Symmetry: C3
Subunit: 152 residues, 3 copies
């Protein structure tokens, strides 16, 4: 057949209400240290827009949710990233809490390639070191054979 | 620049109809062994609410979907977990099948840290063992040099 | 307690408009090489329906989105896969661009088992090779002890 395990998916998040099927239109998102209350600025962590060229621009919290339920900045849809896993709290436009998640971690595709590069390197180092160890061993075995023959 | 590969996302699932843009309001979800029919109780696997403190309480199937398309128990939104990947079947409030997926596996963030801890330990064990092997080898090399000198 | 880190989730994607809370009804999706414009056929990559038995049938682009926001072929909901991470562009029924994502990578559960099998094998090979190296070393140590005793 063929091995094909990458699924066509929608990576752009949408945020909807908790009790009705509606977007959190003009809602607010706060992002903080895991297992903390991110509405408290002391718990907040840096958030960045990732631009199309892959650069990052730090922005202020809260994140804003549009009528589609999507995060926007300056009238445009944006992808927001952090360095680490994080807590999140979502509020609706009336200031009522929609949701709270203590620990959220979704990696974008760059993390997968970084990890794959790291793994590749690691395995090469171990295998290279094993091969070098075997070469040291076979040289020793040869020295031993020579000694044995020397002494009868 | 900065490396930031954690994307702000919405980890709370929503369940919607297959032919119209609507929540599966008062729908039902069944969870079972991979590649099985989970409506059959003999194929069902334990499901648990994961509470805010991280504890688990086993609950009965089906899981219930509210007007927002979100899983609820006892009038509150809940996160449901299983130990293993699983099949899932979704029915609407009229008893009509909405969807069936044979094999679903989404890990929450705790799995990532468990795996990272396991990896860290593993690599340390291999590297420690390599270093110990090299130390054994260099001691042997030294014994061999001494022998060589002894016998001319 | 119990370790349960598989979260009940909805793996079937839905595609919604960018400025209103609505499905991209009768929309179109194009899938291509990462960081390319997938509306250009020269940038497109093979897309396949993954059938219930796990087989694959290649289909033509664009992918079509129904009134629910879900991908359909021949009047039925389908799961679409590619071999590699990919770019994606979404258009609405009027030909207006809804979204563009340069690099999308979501693995279905089969990738996790392939990777787990590969990891298991790898670690077994390294550990087996370490054990064999130690056995070579202990045999050498024994030969050295014998030599030492022979020569005083």
């Amino acid at each position: 057949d063929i091995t094909a395990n990458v699924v066509v998916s929608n990576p752009r998040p949408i945020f909807t209400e908790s009790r009705s099927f509606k977007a959190v239109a003009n809602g607010k998102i706060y992002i903080g240290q895991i297992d903390t209350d991110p509405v408290n600025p002391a718990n907040q962590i840096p958030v960045y827009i990732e631009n199309e060229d892959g650069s990052h621009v730090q922005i202020t919290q809260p994140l804003i949710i549009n009528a589609a339920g999507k995060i926007v900045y300056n009238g445009q849809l944006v992808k927001i990233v952090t360095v680490q896993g994080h807590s999140m709290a979502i509020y609706d436009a009336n200031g009522s809490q929609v949701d709270y998640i203590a620990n959220v971690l979704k990696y974008d595709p760059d993390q997968y390639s970084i990890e794959a590069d790291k793994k590749f390197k690691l395995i090469k180092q171990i295998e290279d070191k094993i091969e070098e160890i075997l070469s040291k061993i076979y040289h020793i075995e040869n020295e031993i054979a020579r000694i044995k023959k020397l002494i009868g």
